[PDB]
Short mmCIF file of C-alpha atoms in Angstrom, two decimals:
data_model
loop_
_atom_site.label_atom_id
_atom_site.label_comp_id
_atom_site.label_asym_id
_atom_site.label_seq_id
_atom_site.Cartn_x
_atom_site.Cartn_y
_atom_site.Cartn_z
CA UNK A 1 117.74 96.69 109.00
CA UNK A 2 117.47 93.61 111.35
CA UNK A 3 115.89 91.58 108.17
CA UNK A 4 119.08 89.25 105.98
CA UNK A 5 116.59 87.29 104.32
CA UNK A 6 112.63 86.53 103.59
CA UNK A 7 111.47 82.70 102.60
CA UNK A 8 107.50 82.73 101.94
CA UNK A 9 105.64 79.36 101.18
CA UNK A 10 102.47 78.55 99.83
CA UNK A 11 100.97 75.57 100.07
CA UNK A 12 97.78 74.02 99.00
CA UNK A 13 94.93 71.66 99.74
CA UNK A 14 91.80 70.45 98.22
CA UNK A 15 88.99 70.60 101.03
CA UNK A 16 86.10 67.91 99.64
CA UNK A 17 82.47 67.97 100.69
CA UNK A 18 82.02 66.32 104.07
CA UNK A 19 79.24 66.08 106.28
CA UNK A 20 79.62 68.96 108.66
CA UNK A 21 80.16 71.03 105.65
CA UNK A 22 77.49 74.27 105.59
CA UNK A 23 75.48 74.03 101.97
CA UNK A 24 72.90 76.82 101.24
CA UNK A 25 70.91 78.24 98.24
CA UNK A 26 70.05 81.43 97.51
CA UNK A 27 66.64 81.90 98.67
CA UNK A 28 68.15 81.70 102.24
CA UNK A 29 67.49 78.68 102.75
CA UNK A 30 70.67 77.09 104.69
CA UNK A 31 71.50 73.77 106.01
CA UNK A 32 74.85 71.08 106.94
CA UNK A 33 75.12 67.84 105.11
CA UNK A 34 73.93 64.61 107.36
CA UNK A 35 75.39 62.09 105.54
CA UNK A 36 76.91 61.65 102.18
CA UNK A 37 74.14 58.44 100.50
CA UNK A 38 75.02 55.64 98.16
CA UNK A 39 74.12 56.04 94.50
CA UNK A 40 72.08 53.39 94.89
CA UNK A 41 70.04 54.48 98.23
CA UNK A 42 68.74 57.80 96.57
CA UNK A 43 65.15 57.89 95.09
CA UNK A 44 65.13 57.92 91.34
CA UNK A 45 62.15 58.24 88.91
CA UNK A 46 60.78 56.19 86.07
CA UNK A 47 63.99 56.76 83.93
CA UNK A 48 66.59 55.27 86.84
CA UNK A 49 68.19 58.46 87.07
CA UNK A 50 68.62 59.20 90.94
CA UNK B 1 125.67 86.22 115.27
CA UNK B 2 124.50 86.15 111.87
CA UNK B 3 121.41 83.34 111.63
CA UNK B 4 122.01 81.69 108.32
CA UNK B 5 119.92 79.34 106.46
CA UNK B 6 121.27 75.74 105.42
CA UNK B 7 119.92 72.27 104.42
CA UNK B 8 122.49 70.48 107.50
CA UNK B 9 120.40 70.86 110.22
CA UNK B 10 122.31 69.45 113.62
CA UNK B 11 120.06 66.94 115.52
CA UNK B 12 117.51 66.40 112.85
CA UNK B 13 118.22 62.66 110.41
CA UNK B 14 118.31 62.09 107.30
CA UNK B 15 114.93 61.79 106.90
CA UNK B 16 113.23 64.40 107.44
CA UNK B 17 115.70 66.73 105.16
CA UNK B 18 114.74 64.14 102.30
CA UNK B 19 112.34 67.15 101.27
CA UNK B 20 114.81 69.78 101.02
CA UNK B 21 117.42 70.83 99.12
CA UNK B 22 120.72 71.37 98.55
CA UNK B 23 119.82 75.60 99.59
CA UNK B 24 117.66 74.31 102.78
CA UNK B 25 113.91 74.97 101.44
CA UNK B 26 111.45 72.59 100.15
CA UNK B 27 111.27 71.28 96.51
CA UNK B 28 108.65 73.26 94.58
CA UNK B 29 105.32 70.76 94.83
CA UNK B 30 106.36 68.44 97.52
CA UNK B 31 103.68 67.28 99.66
CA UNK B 32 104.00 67.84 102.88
CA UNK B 33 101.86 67.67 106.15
CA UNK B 34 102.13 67.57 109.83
CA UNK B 35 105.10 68.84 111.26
CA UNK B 36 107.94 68.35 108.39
CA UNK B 37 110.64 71.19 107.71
CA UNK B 38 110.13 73.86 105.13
CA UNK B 39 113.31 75.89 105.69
CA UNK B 40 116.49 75.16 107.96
CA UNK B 41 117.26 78.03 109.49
CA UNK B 42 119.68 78.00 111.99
CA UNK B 43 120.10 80.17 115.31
CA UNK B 44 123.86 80.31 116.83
CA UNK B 45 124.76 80.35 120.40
CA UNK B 46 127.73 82.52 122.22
CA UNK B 47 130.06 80.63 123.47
CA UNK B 48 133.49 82.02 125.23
CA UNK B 49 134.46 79.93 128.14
CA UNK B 50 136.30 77.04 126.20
CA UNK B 51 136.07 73.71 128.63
CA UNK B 52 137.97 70.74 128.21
CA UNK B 53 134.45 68.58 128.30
CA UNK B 54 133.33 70.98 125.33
CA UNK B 55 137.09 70.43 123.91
CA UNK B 56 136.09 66.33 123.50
CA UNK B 57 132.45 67.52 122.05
CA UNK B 58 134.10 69.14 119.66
CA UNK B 59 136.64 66.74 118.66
CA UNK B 60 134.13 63.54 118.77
CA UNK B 61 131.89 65.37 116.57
CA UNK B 62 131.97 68.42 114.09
CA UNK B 63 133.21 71.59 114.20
CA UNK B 64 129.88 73.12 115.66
CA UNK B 65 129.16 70.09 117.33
CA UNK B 66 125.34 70.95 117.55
CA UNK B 67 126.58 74.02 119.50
CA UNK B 68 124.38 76.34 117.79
CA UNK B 69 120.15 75.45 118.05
CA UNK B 70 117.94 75.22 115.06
CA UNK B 71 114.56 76.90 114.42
CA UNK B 72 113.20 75.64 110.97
CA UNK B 73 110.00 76.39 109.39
CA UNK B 74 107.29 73.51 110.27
CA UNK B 75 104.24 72.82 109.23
CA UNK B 76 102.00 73.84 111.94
CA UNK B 77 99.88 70.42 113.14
CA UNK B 78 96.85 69.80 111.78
CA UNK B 79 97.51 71.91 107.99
CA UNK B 80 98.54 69.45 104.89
CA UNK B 81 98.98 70.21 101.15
CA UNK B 82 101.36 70.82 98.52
CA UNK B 83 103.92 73.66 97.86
CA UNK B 84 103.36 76.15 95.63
CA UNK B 85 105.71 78.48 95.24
CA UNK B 86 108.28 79.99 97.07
CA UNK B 87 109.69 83.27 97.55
CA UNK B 88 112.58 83.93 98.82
CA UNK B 89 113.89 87.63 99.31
CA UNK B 90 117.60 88.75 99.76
CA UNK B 91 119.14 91.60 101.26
CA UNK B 92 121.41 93.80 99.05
CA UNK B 93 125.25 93.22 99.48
CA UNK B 94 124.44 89.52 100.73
CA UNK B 95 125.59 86.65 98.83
CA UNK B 96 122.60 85.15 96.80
CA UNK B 97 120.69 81.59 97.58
CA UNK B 98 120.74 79.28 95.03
CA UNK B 99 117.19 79.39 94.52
CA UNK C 1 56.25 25.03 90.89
CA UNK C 2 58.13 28.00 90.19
CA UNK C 3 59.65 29.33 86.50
CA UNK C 4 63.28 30.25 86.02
CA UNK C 5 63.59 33.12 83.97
CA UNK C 6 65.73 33.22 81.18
CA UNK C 7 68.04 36.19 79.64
CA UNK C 8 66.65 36.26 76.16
CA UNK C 9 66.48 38.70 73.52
CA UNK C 10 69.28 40.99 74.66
CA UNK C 11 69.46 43.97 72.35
CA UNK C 12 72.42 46.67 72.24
CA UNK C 13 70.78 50.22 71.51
CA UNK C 14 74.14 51.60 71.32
CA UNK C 15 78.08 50.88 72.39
CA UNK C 16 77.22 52.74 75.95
CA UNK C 17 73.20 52.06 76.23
CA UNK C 18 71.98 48.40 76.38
CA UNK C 19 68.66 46.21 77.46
CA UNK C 20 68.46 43.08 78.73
CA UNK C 21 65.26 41.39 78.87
CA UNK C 22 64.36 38.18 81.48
CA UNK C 23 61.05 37.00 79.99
CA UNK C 24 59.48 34.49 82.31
CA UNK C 25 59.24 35.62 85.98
CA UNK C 26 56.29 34.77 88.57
CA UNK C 27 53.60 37.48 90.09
CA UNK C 28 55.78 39.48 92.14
CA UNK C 29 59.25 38.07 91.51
CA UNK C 30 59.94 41.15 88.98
CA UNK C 31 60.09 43.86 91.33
CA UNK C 32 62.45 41.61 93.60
CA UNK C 33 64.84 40.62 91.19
CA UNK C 34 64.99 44.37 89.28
CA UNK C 35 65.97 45.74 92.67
CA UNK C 36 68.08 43.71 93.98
CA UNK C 37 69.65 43.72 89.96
CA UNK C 38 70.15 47.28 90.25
CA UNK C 39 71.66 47.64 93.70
CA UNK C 40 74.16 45.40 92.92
CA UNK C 41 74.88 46.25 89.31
CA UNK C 42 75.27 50.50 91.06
CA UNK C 43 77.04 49.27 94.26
CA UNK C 44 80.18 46.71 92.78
CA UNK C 45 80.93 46.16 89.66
CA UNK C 46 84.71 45.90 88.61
CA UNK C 47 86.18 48.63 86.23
CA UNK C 48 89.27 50.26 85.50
CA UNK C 49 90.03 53.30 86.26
CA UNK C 50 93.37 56.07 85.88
CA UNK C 51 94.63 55.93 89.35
CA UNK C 52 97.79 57.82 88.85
CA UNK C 53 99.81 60.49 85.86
CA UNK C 54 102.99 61.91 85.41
CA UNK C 55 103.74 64.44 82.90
CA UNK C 56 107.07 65.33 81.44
CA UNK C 57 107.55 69.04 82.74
CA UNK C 58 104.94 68.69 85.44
CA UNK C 59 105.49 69.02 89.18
CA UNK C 60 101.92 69.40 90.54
CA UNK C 61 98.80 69.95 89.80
CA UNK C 62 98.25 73.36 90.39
CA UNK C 63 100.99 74.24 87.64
CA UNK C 64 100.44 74.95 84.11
CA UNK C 65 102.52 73.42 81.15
CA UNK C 66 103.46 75.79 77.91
CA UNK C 67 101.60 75.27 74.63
CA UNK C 68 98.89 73.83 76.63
CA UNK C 69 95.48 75.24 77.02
CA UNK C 70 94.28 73.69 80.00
CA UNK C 71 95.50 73.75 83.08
CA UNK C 72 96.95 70.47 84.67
CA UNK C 73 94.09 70.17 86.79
CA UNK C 74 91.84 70.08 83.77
CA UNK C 75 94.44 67.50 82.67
CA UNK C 76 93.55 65.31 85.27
CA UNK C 77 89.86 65.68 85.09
CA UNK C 78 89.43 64.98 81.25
CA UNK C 79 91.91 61.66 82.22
CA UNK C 80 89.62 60.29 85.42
CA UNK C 81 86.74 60.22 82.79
CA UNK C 82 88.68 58.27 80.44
CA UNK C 83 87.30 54.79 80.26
CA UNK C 84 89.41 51.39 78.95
CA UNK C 85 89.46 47.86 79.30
CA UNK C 86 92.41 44.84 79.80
CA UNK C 87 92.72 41.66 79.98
CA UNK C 88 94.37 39.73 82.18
CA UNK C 89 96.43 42.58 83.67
CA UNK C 90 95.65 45.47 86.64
CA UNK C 91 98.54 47.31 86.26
CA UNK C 92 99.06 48.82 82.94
CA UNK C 93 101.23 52.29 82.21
CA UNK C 94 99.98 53.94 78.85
CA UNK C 95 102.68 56.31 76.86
CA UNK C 96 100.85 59.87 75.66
CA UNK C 97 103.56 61.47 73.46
CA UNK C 98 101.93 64.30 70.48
CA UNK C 99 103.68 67.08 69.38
CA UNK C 100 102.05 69.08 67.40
CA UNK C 101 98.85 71.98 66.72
CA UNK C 102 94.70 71.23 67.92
CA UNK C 103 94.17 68.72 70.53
CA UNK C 104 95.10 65.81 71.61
CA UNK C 105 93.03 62.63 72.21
CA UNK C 106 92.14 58.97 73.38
CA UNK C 107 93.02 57.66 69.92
CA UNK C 108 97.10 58.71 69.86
CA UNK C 109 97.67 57.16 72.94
CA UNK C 110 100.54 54.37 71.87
CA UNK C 111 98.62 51.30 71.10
CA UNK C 112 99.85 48.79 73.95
CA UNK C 113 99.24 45.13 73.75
CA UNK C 114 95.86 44.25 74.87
CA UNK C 115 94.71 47.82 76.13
CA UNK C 116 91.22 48.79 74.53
CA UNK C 117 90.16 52.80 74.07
CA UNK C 118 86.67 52.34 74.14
CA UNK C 119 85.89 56.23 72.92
CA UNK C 120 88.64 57.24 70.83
CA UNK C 121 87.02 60.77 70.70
CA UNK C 122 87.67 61.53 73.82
CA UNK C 123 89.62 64.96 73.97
CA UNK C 124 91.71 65.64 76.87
CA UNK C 125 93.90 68.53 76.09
CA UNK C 126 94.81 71.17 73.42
CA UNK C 127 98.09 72.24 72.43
CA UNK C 128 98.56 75.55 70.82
CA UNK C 129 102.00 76.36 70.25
CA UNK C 130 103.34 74.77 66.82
CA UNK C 131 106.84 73.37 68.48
CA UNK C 132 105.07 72.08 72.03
CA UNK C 133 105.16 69.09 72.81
CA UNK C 134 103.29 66.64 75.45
CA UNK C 135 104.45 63.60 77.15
CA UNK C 136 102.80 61.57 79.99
CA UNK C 137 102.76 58.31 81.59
CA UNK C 138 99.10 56.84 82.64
CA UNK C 139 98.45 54.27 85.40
CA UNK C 140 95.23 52.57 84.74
CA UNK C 141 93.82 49.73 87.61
CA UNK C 142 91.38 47.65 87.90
CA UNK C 143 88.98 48.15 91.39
CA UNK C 144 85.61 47.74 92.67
CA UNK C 145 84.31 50.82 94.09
CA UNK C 146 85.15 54.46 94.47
CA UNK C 147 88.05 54.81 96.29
CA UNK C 148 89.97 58.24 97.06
CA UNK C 149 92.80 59.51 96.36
CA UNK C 150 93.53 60.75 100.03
CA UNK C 151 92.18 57.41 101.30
CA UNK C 152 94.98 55.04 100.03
CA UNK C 153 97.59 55.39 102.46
CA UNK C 154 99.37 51.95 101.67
CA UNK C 155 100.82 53.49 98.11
CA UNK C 156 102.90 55.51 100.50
CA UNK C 157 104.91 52.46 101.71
CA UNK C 158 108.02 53.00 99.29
CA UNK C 159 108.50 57.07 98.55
CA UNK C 160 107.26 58.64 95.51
CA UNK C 161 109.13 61.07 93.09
CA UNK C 162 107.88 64.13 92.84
CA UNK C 163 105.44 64.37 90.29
CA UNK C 164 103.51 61.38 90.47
CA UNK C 165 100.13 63.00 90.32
CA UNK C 166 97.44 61.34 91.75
CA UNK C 167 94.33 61.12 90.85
CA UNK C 168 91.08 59.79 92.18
CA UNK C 169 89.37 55.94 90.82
CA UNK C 170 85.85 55.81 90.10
CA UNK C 171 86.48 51.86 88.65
CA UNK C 172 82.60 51.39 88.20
CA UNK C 173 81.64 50.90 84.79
CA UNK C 174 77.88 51.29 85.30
CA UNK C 175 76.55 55.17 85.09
CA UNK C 176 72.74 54.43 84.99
CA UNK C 177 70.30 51.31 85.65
CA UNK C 178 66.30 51.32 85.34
CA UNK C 179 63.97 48.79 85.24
CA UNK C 180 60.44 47.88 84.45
CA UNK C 181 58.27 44.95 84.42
CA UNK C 182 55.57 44.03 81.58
CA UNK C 183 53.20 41.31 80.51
CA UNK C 184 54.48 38.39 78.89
CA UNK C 185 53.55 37.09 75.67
CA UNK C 186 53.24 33.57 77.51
CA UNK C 187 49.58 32.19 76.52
CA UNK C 188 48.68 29.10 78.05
CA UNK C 189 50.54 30.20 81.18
CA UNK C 190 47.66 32.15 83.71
CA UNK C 191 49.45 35.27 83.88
CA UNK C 192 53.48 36.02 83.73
CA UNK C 193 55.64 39.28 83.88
CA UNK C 194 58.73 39.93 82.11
CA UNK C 195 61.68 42.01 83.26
CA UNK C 196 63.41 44.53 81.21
CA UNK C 197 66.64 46.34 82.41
CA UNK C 198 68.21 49.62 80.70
CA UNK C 199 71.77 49.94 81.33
CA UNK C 200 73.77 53.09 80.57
CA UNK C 201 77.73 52.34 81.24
CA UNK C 202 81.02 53.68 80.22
CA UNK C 203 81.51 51.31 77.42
CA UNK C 204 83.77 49.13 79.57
CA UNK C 205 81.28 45.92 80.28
CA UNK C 206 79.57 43.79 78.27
CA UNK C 207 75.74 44.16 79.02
CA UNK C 208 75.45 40.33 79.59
CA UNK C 209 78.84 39.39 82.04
CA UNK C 210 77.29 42.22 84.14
CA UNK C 211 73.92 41.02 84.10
CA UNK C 212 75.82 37.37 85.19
CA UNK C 213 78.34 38.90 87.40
CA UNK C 214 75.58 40.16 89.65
CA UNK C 215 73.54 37.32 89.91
CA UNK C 216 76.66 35.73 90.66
CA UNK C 217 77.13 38.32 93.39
CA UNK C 218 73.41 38.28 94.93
CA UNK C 219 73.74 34.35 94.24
CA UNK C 220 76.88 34.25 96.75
CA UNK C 221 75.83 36.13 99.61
CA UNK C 222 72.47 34.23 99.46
CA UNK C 223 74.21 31.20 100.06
CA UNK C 224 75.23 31.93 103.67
CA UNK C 225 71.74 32.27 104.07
CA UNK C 226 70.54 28.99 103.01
CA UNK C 227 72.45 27.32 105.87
CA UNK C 228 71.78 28.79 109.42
CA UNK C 229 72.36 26.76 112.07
CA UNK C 230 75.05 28.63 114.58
CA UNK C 231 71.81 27.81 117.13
CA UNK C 232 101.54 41.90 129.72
CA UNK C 233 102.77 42.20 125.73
CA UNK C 234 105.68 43.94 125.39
CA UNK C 235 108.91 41.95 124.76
CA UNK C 236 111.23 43.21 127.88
CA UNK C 237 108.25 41.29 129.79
CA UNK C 238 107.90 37.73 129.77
CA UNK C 239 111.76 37.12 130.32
CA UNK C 240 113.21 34.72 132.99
CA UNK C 241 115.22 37.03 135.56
CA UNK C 242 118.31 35.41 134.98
CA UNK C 243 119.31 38.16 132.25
CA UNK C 244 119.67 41.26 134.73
CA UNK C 245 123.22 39.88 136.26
CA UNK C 246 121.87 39.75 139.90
CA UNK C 247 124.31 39.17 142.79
CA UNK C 248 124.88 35.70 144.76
CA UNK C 249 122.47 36.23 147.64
CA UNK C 250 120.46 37.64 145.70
CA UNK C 251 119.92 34.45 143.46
CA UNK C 252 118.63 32.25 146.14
CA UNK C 253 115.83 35.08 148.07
CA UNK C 254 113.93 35.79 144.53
CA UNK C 255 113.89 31.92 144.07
CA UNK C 256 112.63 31.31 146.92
CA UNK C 257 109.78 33.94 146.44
CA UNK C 258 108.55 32.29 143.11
CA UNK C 259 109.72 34.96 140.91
CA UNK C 260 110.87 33.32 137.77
CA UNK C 261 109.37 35.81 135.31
CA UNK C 262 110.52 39.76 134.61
CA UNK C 263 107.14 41.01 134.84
CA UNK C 264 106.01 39.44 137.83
CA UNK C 265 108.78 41.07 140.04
CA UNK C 266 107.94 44.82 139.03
CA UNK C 267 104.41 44.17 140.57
CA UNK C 268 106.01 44.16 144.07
CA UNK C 269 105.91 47.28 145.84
CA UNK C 270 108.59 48.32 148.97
CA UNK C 271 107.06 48.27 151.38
CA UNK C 272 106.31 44.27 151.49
CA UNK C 273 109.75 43.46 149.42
CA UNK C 274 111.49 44.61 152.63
CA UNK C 275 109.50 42.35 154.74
CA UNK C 276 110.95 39.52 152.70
CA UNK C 277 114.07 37.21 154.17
CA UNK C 278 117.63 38.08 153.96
CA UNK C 279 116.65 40.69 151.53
CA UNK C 280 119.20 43.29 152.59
CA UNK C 281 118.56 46.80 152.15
CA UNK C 282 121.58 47.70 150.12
CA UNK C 283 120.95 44.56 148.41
CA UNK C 284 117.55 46.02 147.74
CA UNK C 285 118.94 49.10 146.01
CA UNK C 286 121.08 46.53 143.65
CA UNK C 287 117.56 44.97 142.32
CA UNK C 288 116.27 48.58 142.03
CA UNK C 289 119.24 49.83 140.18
CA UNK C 290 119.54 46.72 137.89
CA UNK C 291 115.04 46.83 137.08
CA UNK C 292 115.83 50.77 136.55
CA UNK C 293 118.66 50.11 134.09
CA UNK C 294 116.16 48.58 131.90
CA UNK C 295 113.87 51.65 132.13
CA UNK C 296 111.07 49.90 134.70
CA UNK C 297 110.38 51.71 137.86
CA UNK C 298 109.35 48.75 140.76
CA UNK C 299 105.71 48.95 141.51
CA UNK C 300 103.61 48.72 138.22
CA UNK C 301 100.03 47.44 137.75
CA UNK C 302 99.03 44.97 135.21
CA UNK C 303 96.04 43.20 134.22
CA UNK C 304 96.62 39.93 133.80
CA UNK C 305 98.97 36.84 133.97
CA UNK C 306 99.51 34.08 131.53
CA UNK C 307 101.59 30.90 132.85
CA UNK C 308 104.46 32.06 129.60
#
């Protein structure tokens, strides 16, 4: 009875990986990111692929 | 009174109601953040002791004058994104938004 | 006393995979060189990249688009892996227009002056419904690095319409770099190692300008190496006092107190202004009045005091 009128608004945002972000696989083995590396600072094997 | 919803919102420029349109609510997929208006909704105020100070107020300026105070929609601080969708819902017997 | 190697017997594989071979090189200057090669060639390299899209009927990109399979998200990811190259321009706007059945592709984009598709078979949408039709506007740049979408902040100097999607800029060419060092087939020399490096790009660069454009790199910031050696702001401030319309006696008292400057009379407080000549205690609240007029309250701190 009091209620004329409803407005409702959605609104969205695309949350990317950061460093405090919470990662875990499924063996429960759980962990936060540290710091997000270079390409070029991560090991790679004999085949340059890091 | 009746609180009605409208894109002139007293006090508030130009530029913040860049976003909103000619109905008072935001375009669908603007991008918005911080504290920017949504919706303009609109609050009145009673008024019934007419003074001659509020008699220049109301000449200088317009016919409210800014008498009655606004209470938009805002982003609450610290949320960002884009709009969706919106969903606006009308009462039977009421005239319909343009949306 | 030391050999220069030089780029010899560079062989393309493929359009994407490449090797470039640097066949004389001392004991241990192999290893060096391949690393410091491959840092470089992963870290900088300038590429283009789609920075920006705007679709016909599109608003955002969490909307979907009749006739179209894929949603305009999926748009936008098949279009940030779309590779090209220009010359001599950093700001080109490619037309998409297909109407039509099956999907669309690279190859119908509307050929532009000097704009080169490097993978024409590059799908990036369907369309399914015989009378749908799609229509965008590409912006491709050229850039160093991978920079965000959310990052640049200057774009948002003038306004944009909305439905200027944005999307984010990888602009390096290079995908995958390895390296490995052999024996050369140098004879009469003691013993010599040649350097092979396996590049795996986008198509964009030519094998041998990148090869050149990072030893021009590693070349450059060596060279600041080779020579050591090296062994009160705000405007209402600073402003003579003879803008706040004082009174007659009240010209000759601050004069003779050495107060020439705005900002060097709000530093004294009452209680040693009154102690002062001839001030006058109404004449006192005229100074007050005047300094709060101007929105400063008598008695701030500063830090410091330049002669302007």
């Amino acid at each position: 009875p009091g209620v004329l009128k409803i407005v409702k608004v959605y609104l969205a945002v695309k949350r990317r990986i950061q460093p405090g972000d919470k990662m875990a696989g499924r063996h429960g083995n759980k962990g936060v990111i540290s710091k997000i590396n270079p390409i070029e600072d991560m090991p790679y094997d004999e085949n340059g692929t890091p | 009174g009746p609180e009605e919803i409208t894109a002139d919102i007293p006090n508030v420029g130009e530029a913040a109601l860049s976003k909103l349109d000619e109905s008072g609510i935001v375009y669908i997929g603007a991008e918005v953040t911080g504290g920017d208006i949504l919706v303009g909704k609109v609050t009145p105020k009673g008024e019934t002791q007419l003074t001659p100070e509020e008699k220049l107020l109301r000449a200088i300026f317009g016919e409210k004058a800014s008498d009655v105070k606004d209470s938009s929609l805002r982003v609450p601080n610290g949320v960002s994104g884009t709009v969706i969708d919106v969903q606006v819902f009308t009462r039977d017997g009421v005239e319909k938004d343009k949306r | 006393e030391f050999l220069k190697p030089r780029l010899v017997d560079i062989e393309q594989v493929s359009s994407t995979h490449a090797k470039v071979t640097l066949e004389p090189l001392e004991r241990g200057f192999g290893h060096t060189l391949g690393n410091a090669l491959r840092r470089i060639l992963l870290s900088s390299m300038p590429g283009c990249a789609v920075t920006e899209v705007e679709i016909d009927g599109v608003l955002h990109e969490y909307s979907t688009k009749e006739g179209v399979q894929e949603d305009i998200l999926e748009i936008l990811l098949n279009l940030k892996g779309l590779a090209v190259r220009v010359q001599g321009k950093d700001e080109v706007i490619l037309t998409l227009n297909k109407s039509g059945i099956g999907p669309v592709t690279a190859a119908d984009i509307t050929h532009d002056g000097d704009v080169e598709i490097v993978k024409p078979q590059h799908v990036i949408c369907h369309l399914t419904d015989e009378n749908a039709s799609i229509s965008m506007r590409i912006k491709v740049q050229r850039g160093r690095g991978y920079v965000p979408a959310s990052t640049r902040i200057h774009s948002e100097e003038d306004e944009r319409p909305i439905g200027r999607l944005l999307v984010d800029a990888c602009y390096s060419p290079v995908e995958r770099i390895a390296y490995n060092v052999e024996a050369a087939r140098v004879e009469q020399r003691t013993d010599l190692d040649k350097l092979v490096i396996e590049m795996e790009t986008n198509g964009t660069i030519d094998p041998e300008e990148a090869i050149r454009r990072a030893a021009t790199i590693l070349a450059e910031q060596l060279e600041a190496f080779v020579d050591l050696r090296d062994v009160e702001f705000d405007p209402i401030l600073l402003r003579p006092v003879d803008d706040l319309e004082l009174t007659v006696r009240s010209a000759n008292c601050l004069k003779a107190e050495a107060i020439h400057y705005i900002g060097d009379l709000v530093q004294r407080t009452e209680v040693e202004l009154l102690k002062t000549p001839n001030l006058g205690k109404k004449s006192l609240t005229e100074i007050k009045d005047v300094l709060a007029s101007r929105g400063l309250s008598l008695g701030m701190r500063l830090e410091n005091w330049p002669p302007a």
